[PDB]
């Protein structure tokens, strides 16, 4: 059920998007399969212009189905904006449980709209699968007992290696400690706020944003573990699949194995980056509320 495999992103204030994780992995898998299939032979390299154009057509059709939930998604953005801003004239200062109920109800409607369009998304996914497998089935060798692996090598060098270097230049585990330190600082402040104030609207707003940041952190932690596991696996596997020959059936298996590893890595790297953006966009607004409490109001 894709209803339990959707990540929600809020990369900038007033913006919200969703990713159906198995659809993102599935589309990315067939993209690697399509590029590996045309880079296997020198004479098919020119097909990359067609592959690039076809992926854009897939992305445009997929986004069009996603846009059918825009009114429901915009209603969720409105609710979040009201719940996060005490100065919103519509923020009626309702109990934290009532705030959570409204937000969960609006979020449920977005997930229901997404589930309602599953068939539409599936038709697009199945076309991307056909596109990639069509090229894969065309792959050929002069001698099927000595197939070249230059396509696997060229594809890794030109499409994947830059992504591995980018992850290795970052310190994803230190990003996790930095986020945990921010959550702890907000938790210490929140307890101290309750001692001073009774049933203050800022306590409810801070609890609301802090709860959202805890969930974003958990998803970043979940995706970071996949990134760390997959960066090592890809580096170890790529060495076994290049500068050598394979029998065609084994070459085909290696291409599918590599596409599988790349898609799991890419899915989590892409989602971790958007979730990182979301965490810090929420923390800026939360820190603005802290400064308002401490330095604007004396408190």
């Amino acid at each position: 059920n894709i209803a339990n495999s959707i990540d929600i992103l809020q990369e900038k204030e007033g913006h919200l998007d969703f990713v159906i994780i198995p659809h993102y992995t599935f589309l990315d898998y067939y993209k690697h399969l399509s590029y590996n299939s045309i880079y296997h032979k020198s004479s098919t390299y020119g097909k990359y212009i067609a592959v690039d154009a076809f992926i854009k057509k897939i992305n445009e059709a997929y986004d069009k189905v996603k846009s059918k939930c825009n009114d429901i998604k915009n209603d969720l953005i409105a609710t979040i904006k009201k719940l996060e801003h005490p100065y919103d004239i519509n923020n009626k200062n309702r109990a934290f449980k009532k705030m959570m109920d409204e937000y969960n109800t609006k979020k449920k409607k977005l997930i229901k709209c997404i589930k309602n369009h599953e068939n539409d998304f599936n038709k697009i996914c199945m076309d991307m699968k056909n596109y990639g497998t069509n090229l894969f089935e065309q792959l050929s060798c002069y001698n099927n007992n000595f197939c070249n692996t230059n396509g696997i090598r060229y594809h890794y060098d030109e499409y994947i290696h830059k992504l591995i270097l980018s992850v290795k230049s970052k310190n994803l585990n230190k990003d996790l400690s930095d986020m945990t330190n921010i959550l702890q600082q907000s938790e210490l402040l929140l307890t101290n706020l309750n001692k001073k104030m009774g049933s203050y609207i800022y306590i409810d707003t801070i609890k609301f944003i802090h709860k959202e940041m805890k969930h974003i952190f958990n998803r970043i932690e979940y995706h970071t573990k996949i990134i760390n596991d997959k960066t090592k696996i890809i580096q170890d596997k790529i060495k076994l699949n290049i500068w050598r020959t394979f029998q065609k059936d084994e070459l085909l298996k290696r291409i599918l194995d590599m596409s599988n590893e790349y898609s799991l890595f890419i899915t989590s790297d892409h989602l971790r980056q958007m979730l990182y953006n979301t965490f810090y966009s929420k923390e800026k607004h939360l820190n603005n509320i802290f400064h308002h409490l401490i330095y604007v109001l004396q408190m």
């Epitope: 154009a53 076809f54 057509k57 897939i58 059709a61 038709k123 199945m126 596109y131 497998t133 089935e137």
Partner: single-chain antibody, 227 residues
């Protein structure tokens, strides 16, 4: 390469169902689109329907009440069953392979087989019906759609006695191996196929085809000959 071959009775009585088989070789039925297209003598190409994604079907609404398209994955074949048949169903029947509807081009066509029987559509206006030109002449064939079809337009070439083949896809993209003297232009409702300098090997019938909406529809065709 993937190859398609039609087979079945060439003569059908009005009391019998027109029943054809397409045997696929060089590749599997799998989740691809398996089409049946027909061409009544002297008339244009008519898309009958397709089986796709390992279980679904889209039929032309003009034939939907009397058509079935099915597969047998163990034999790697697909079938056409057209009932309530009349002399109007006499046509060359083609089976054709298609990979996606996102980019609705037909990439493999069977040679075709003659079978003799004893308003919402996007209308593709192709012109001229026939053309006669000298070697080195510029040739412009037009396709005008009754509705906006964005860039969802393809061109096919049918050389004498050969199967139809993809020439240009998505208005201006050349299929692999097609010479640079061919080009395609247009957008929305107006499209053109241009042969900058006609060569003897270009003698063929050309067809435009839209995939913006179902049913898939084709232009009436343009026969090009040397004068």
């Amino acid at each position: 390469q993937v190859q398609l071959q039609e087979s079945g009775p060439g003569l059908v009585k009005p009391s019998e169902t027109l029943s054809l088989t397409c045997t696929v070789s060089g590749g599997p039925i799998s989740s691809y689109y398996w089409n049946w297209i027909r061409q009544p003598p002297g008339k244009g190409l008519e898309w009958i329907g397709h089986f796709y994604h390992s279980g679904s079907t889209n039929y032309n609404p003009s034939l939907k009440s009397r058509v079935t398209i099915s597969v047998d994955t163990s034999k790697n074949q697909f079938y056409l069953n057209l009932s309530s048949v009349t002399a109007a169903d006499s046509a060359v029947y083609f089976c054709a392979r298609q990979v996606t509807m996102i980019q609705g081009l037909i990439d493999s066509w069977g040679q075709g087989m003659l079978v003799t029987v004893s308003g919402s559509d996007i209308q593709m206006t192709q012109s001229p019906s026939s053309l006669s030109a000298s070697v080195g002449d510029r040739v412009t064939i037009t396709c005008q759609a009754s509705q906006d079809i964005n860039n969802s337009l393809n061109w096919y070439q049918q050389k004498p006695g050969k199967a139809l083949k993809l020439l240009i896809y998505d208005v201006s993209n050349l299929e692999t191996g097609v010479p640079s003297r061919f080009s395609g232009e247009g957008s929305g409702t107006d499209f053109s196929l241009i042969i900058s300098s006609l060569q003897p090997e270009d003698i063929a019938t050309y067809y435009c085809q839209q995939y913006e909406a179902l049913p898939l529809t084709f232009g009436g065709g343009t026969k090009v000959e040397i004068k």
